[PDB]
Design a protein around this ligand. Structure first.
Ligand code: CLA
Ligand code: CLA
Ligand code: CLA
Ligand code: CLA
Ligand code: CLA
Ligand code: CLA
Ligand code: CLA
Ligand code: KC2
Ligand SMILES: CC1=C(C#C/C(C)=C/C=C/C(C)=C/C=C/C=C(C)/C=C/C=C(\C)C#CC2=C(C)C[C@@H](O)CC2(C)C)C(C)(C)C[C@H](O)C1
Ligand SMILES: CC1=C(C#C/C(C)=C/C=C/C(C)=C/C=C/C=C(C)/C=C/C=C(\C)C#CC2=C(C)C[C@@H](O)CC2(C)C)C(C)(C)C[C@H](O)C1
Ligand SMILES: CC1=CCCC(C)(C)[C@H]1/C=C/C(C)=C/C=C/C(C)=C/C=C/C=C(C)/C=C/C=C(C)/C=C/C1=C(C)CCCC1(C)C
Lengths: 45, 172, 35, 34, 180
């Protein structure tokens, strides 16, 4: 009942898909200049 | 001026570069397809046949105990079901992936057709011995491809295995 | 019923993850006044 | 611990090559008409 | 000129003696179209994953932890018996090891961006990679064990799926496929 997950197999999509996308995002994240900006928002992208 | 057939002219691309050449390409298959691909095929068919001929003879005289005794061709059927068939197909297919890579190399001209570089017992001592043997193989492959076809059709009709038929001719 | 549920969960998780990580990809910088 | 530079094709070209293994193998180019 | 492994074919151009475990076997030429450093990291990681896994299939059958549901001898069957949450906790711990080990550079383009000769995630607790000659020969071993394990795990998994028996047990009391 925790996410409507009555069958363990339902947890394979709820984890693998967010991880995989995050993996695509990690490459975007590694390409960014990640030093601190003293600003309202970061214009470096 | 084909040597094998004096009358017909030598087919244009059969010039004796490959051994086993008597100019016999009457229907001109040589011109339409790459000769190199064809030699690969001559030997590859020949190699299966030269082996199969041995097998029909051996399978008749002796069969391993664990397999039921059957006539050589009958077995294509039991083995389709025991599952031995798949194994012999899986492996001969695996060897063949490498064969596709080998062919593409022949087409790029980097491999002599029919050469898998297998001479483990090193029988080929000299470049002449290679030419002698290489011709012998091409002759045996041609004889065997004919004979295996015979062993099978004669059985389809006589319903007798080849050695048995020779013993009891049992003419139609 | 399980297969429809797993397909729906896969689709919803994919789209929600795309939304979440897209708005995490420095969305404020995607304005015409950014230099 | 060898680290070759690999100034070669990109990852997408490699994936396209692996797909061309199954939709365009060099099997039939050996038999080409003249 | 010619691959050592496949004499008929040509040495894959990219492969030279420098990478370890190189007998020239890249017939389909994946090397030409991907980064050897990415490819090696995968040859190693799948093996290291299946050196732990293959040992795992054998150990689980002989000895099982005391906790409930850790009692199924067959590895494939055990995956279902063990509590699902625990399996996810393992997933995540491994997932963290991935990000920390690679330093967050987790993609084909960036993993090797700083140094990181493929497979050097830094685990050499007892320094044994100080001699170079020693390192060059240990590296062949890892690859040769990684390559065997890959083949072994597949065989054990598939043979268990048919037999519903762990590897050592199936060899004992072996029965032909028809019986199962
Ligand atoms: C590389 C290893 C390997 C493995 C794991 C297998 C797997 C198998 N082969 Mg296939 N096979 C292989 C290589 C392999 N083969 C090779 C190199 C060849 C020669 C081309 C074949 C040709 C082949 C044939 C003709 C047959 C198999 C058979 C077998 C099966 C025997 C099953 C059994 O009950 O054991 C038997 C028990 C023992 C051997 C006791 C020890 C098994 C699925 C048999 C099969 O398919 O059964 C359905 C079978 O008839 N193998
Ligand atoms: C070299 C290949 C070859 C092979 C395998 C055969 C095989 C056969 N021929 Mg045959 N034949 C051949 C070449 C060949 N022939 C040639 C070159 C000619 C001349 C052009 C003939 C002319 C011929 C005739 C005229 C007849 C056969 C017949 C037969 C069959 C007789 C069956 C039997 O018990 O006889 C065993 C043979 C001996 C013991 C000797 C048999 C299948 C007969 C047939 O049709 O079957 C009733 C028949 O009437 N053949
Ligand atoms: C519409 C897309 C498309 C196109 C343009 C091609 C084009 C080609 N295919 Mg085909 N192929 C396709 C879809 C396509 N394929 C699909 C969907 C399948 C089945 C999954 C195949 C299965 C197939 C086989 C089995 C073979 C080819 C081969 C070939 C090549 C033949 C020329 C040659 O020998 O060199 C050529 C490049 C042949 C070849 O030799 O490739 C180099 C070959 O052996 N193709
Ligand atoms: C995921 C597994 C994996 C990966 C990524 C690699 C990666 C690599 N190997 Mg290794 N190798 C592996 C498994 C793997 N290998 C196994 C299992 C064996 C034992 C058969 C070997 C034996 C081997 C030798 C002997 C050599 C290499 C070499 C290489 C390098 C160049 C070849 C290449 O790019 O292949 C890329 C391979 C893949 C992308 C995997 C193939 C995926 C296909 C599509 C499916 C596999 C199924 C296959 C068809 C059989 C099933 C039927 C590269 C670093 C060469 C080297 O060290 O050069 C530096 C070399 O000489 N490998
Ligand atoms: C690919 C690797 C792999 C995977 C996916 C699994 C997965 C699983 N194992 Mg197996 N196992 C492995 C390797 C693996 N194991 C190895 C290498 C050993 C030998 C020590 C074991 C011994 C083992 C036992 C004894 C039991 C399991 C059990 C289980 C299940 C529950 C998880 C658990 O309690 O783990 C417990 C596993 C361990 C405590 C061993 C982990 C050791 C890691 C893999 C090696 C790390 C060493 C490395 C040098 C340290 C680096 C430091 C930085 C699960 C299906 C249980 C089960 O249900 O079996 C029926 C169980 O009772 N495992
Ligand atoms: C939070 C979890 C997490 C995260 C973020 C990562 C992060 C990473 N992992 Mg993963 N990993 C994890 C958990 C995680 N790991 C766990 C728990 C395991 C099991 C122990 C693994 C096992 C694993 C392996 C074996 C490999 C990685 C790799 C990687 C790196 C590249 C990721 C990538 O592009 O793959 C994105 C996802 C994909 C590209 C899909 C996978 C590709 C499929 C499965 C290939 C199928 C081949 C096919 C079956 C063969 C053809 C057969 C033929 C007949 C046609 C990255 C650092 C790879 C790496 O370092 O490469 C250099 C690598 O080889 N990881
Ligand atoms: C390290 C390798 C290895 C070994 C030693 C075995 C061992 C065995 N396997 Mg497994 N197998 C493996 C891995 C291995 N397997 C792999 C990589 C796969 C593919 C995933 C399988 C596929 C497989 C299946 C599907 C099963 C067999 C089966 C068998 C048995 C029959 C083998 C046989 O008669 O082959 C015949 C081969 C020969 C007689 C000639 C081999 C000559 C050279 C050395 C190869 C045997 C006990 C069966 C089993 O376990 O129970 C029935 C079965 O069903 N094997
Ligand atoms: C090596 C990977 C790994 C790490 C790094 C790790 C860290 C922690 C930490 C942080 C320090 C805490 C606080 C914690 C706590 C619990 N872990 Mg543990 N854990 C790991 C692996 C496993 C496995 C494989 C299982 C497991 C379990 C439990 C249960 C029992 C629940 C219950 O009582 O039923 C509790 C409370 C079992 C499970 O969750 O079963 C439902 C079980 O199978 N864990 N775990
Ligand atoms: C390459 C390699 C190696 C190797 C090797 C090998 C394995 C060599 C094997 C060679 C073989 C087996 C050649 C077999 C040829 C069979 C033939 C020509 C059949 C002829 C049948 C005829 C004429 C007939 C017939 C009949 C018909 C049709 C039907 C009947 O009614 C009548 C009749 C009986 C007349 C090794 C390791 C050794 C060493 C090396 O380092 C590399
Ligand atoms: C133990 C643990 C289990 C698990 C474990 C898990 C983690 C299993 C881990 C598994 C994976 C990572 C094993 C990977 C195997 C890949 C091998 C077989 C390779 C084939 C490549 C070769 C043939 C090639 C060749 C190629 C060469 C290189 C170059 C090319 O040009 C040519 C060619 C294509 C021919 C589970 C979870 C089930 C539970 C259990 O209770 C405990
Ligand atoms: C199982 C299932 C239940 C349990 C849990 C689970 C997660 C749900 C899941 C686990 C699953 C995973 C782990 C299952 C997937 C498993 C395993 C790891 C796949 C292994 C494949 C081995 C292949 C077929 C090799 C053939 C080797 C070749 C012929 C050697 C070739 C060689 C080269 C080319 C040339 C030289 C010599 C030769 C010998 C010719």
């Amino acid at each position: 009942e925790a996410l409507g997950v009555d069958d363990g197999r339902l947890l394979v999509p709820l984890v693998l898909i967010p991880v995989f996308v995050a993996l695509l995002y990690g490459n975007f994240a590694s390409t960014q200049d990640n030093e601190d900006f003293f600003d309202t928002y970061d214009q470096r992208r | 001026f084909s040597a094998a057939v004096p009358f017909l002219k030598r087919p244009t691309n059969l010039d004796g570069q490959y051994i086993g050449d008597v100019g016999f390409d009457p229907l001109g298959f040589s011109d339409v397809f790459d000769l190199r691909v064809l030699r690969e095929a001559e030997l590859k068919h020949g190699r299966f046949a030269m082996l199969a001929t041995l097998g029909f003879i051996v399978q008749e005289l002796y069969t391993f105990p664990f397999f039921p005794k059957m006539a050589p061709v009958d077995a294509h059927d039991y083995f389709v079901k025991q599952g031995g068939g798949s194994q012999i197909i899986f492996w001969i297919s695996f060897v063949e992936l490498f064969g596709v890579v080998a062919l593409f190399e022949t087409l790029q001209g980097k491999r002599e057709p029919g050469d898998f570089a297998f001479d483990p017992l090193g029988l080929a001592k000299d470049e002449a011995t290679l030419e002698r043997y290489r011709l012998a193989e091409v002759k045996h492959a041609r004889l065997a491809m004919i004979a295996i076809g015979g062993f099978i059709h004669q059985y389809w009709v006589t319903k007798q295995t080849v050695l048995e038929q020779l013993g009891n001719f049992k003419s139609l | 019923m399980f297969t429809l549920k797993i397909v729906v969960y896969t689709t919803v998780t994919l789209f929600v993850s795309l939304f979440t990580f897209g708005f995490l990809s420095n969305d404020a910088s995607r304005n015409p006044n950014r230099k | 611990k060898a680290a070759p530079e690999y100034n070669g094709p990109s990852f997408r070209e490699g994936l396209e090559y692996v797909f061309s293994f199954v939709w365009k193998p060099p099997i039939l180019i050996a038999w080409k008409p003249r | 000129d010619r691959s050592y492994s496949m004499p008929f074919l040509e040495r894959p151009p990219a492969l030279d003696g420098s990478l370890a475990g190189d007998v020239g076997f890249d017939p389909l030429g994946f090397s030409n179209y991907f980064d050897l450093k990415w490819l090696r990291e995968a040859e190693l990681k799948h093996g290291r994953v299946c050196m732990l896994g293959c040992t795992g299939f054998i150990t689980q059958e002989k000895i099982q932890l005391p906790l409930p549901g850790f009692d199924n001898k067959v590895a494939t069957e055990a995956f279902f018996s063990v509590p699902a949450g625990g399996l996810w906790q393992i997933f995540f711990t491994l997932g963290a090891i991935e990000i920390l080990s690679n330093g967050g550079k987790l993609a084909p383009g960036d993993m090797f961006a700083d140094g990181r000769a493929p497979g050097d995630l830094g685990f050499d607790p007892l320094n044994l990679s100080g001699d170079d000659a020693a390192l060059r020969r240990f590296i062949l071993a890892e690859l040769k064990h990684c390559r065997l394990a890959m083949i072994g795990l597949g065989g054990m998994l598939h043979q268990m799926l048919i037999t519903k028996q762990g590897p050592l047990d199936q060899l004992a009391n072996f029965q032909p496929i028809q019986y199962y």
